[PDB]
Write a protein that binds this ligand. Structure first.
Ligand code: NO6
Length: 272
């Protein structure tokens, strides 16, 4: 019933990430990013009971750590994306291998005109929302709908160099964690006109902290992976009011420099 998952698929980050990972100041501490990453990996694996499929790092692919961009998974059908950046399209080769070893329904985005980034796809359990930016185009959302037939797909424009989940994420069933800046409050109002259902809102002052990770572990509660108070204290105050969720402060300050967030580093899978 939304949020249930049994497997997580991640990928180690390479040394190429420090100097050659795409971004939109301050250099990246490669050692710290991989310390924050394994702790991130430890929470999905040894903490929340999921088994984490760790994928080896490819030094020719600086952004290989952000596996969400190359796969959108729903129920028993996984969509292999064609990323917006041509240099990221080879990240999908090992992604397809691993997801196959899990025996999912594999739909590859092969249209030479299709580009879709997994960070631009916000799935609410009832329908999809696809950000329209330079990474995800119109037709790129049209294979997403063609892939997942039983869900409505509505597209929302994303300005600047952002993804859709750069300022928003699901913090619960029918609950949408939203940022407070002007671009997020604009994309949120647009999405609620297309949906015939009324969604809830968890407004946080920091757009980066609006990207969380919601999980539903049976008899364990509703788990929320949010940004630590050291990273964003004003936004961690909001998540602290949720006394009925298992709150876990996860740090991602290094990978945030290359526009990498909590959601983008793992592909969550329910296999039953
Ligand atoms: C998660 C949330 C928002 N944006 C992303 C893409 S970052 C990966 C790479 N640096 C890039 O293509 O910008 C992931």
């Amino acid at each position: 019933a939304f949020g249930r998952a049994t497997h997580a698929v991640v990928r180690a980050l390479p040394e190429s990430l420090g100097q050659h990972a795409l971004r939109s100041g301050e250099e990246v501490d490669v050692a710290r990013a991989e310390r924050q990453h394994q702790l991130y990996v430890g929470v999905l694996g040894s903490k929340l009971g999921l088994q984490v499929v760790e994928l080896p790092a490819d030094e020719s692919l600086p952004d290989c750590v952000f596996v969400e961009d190359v796969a959108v998974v729903c129920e028993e059908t996984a969509l292999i994306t064609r990323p917006g950046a041509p240099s990221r399209r080879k990240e999908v080769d090992m992604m397809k291998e691993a997801l196959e070893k899990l025996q999912l329904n594999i739909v590859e985005m092969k249209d030479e005109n299709a580009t879709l980034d997994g960070g631009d796809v916000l799935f609410t359990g009832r329908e999809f929302f696809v950000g329209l930016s330079k990474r995800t185009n119109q037709r790129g959302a049209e294979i997403l709908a063609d892939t997942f037939k039983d869900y409505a797909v509505s597209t929302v424009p994303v300005a600047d160099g952002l993804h859709l989940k750069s300022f928003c994420s699901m913090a619960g069933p029918n609950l949408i964690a939203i940022g407070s800046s002007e671009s997020a409050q604009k994309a949120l109002k647009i999405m609620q006109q297309m949906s015939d259902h009324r969604y809830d809102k968890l407004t946080v002052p920091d757009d980066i902290a609006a990207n969380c990770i919601y999980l539903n572990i049976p008899n364990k509660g509703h788990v929320l992976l949010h940004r630590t108070p050291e990273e964003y204290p004003e936004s961690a105050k909001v998540y602290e009011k949720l006394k009925d969720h298992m709150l876990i402060p996860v740090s991602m300050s290094e990978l945030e420099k290359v526009d990498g967030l909590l959601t983008c580093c793992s592909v969550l899978i329910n296999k039953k």
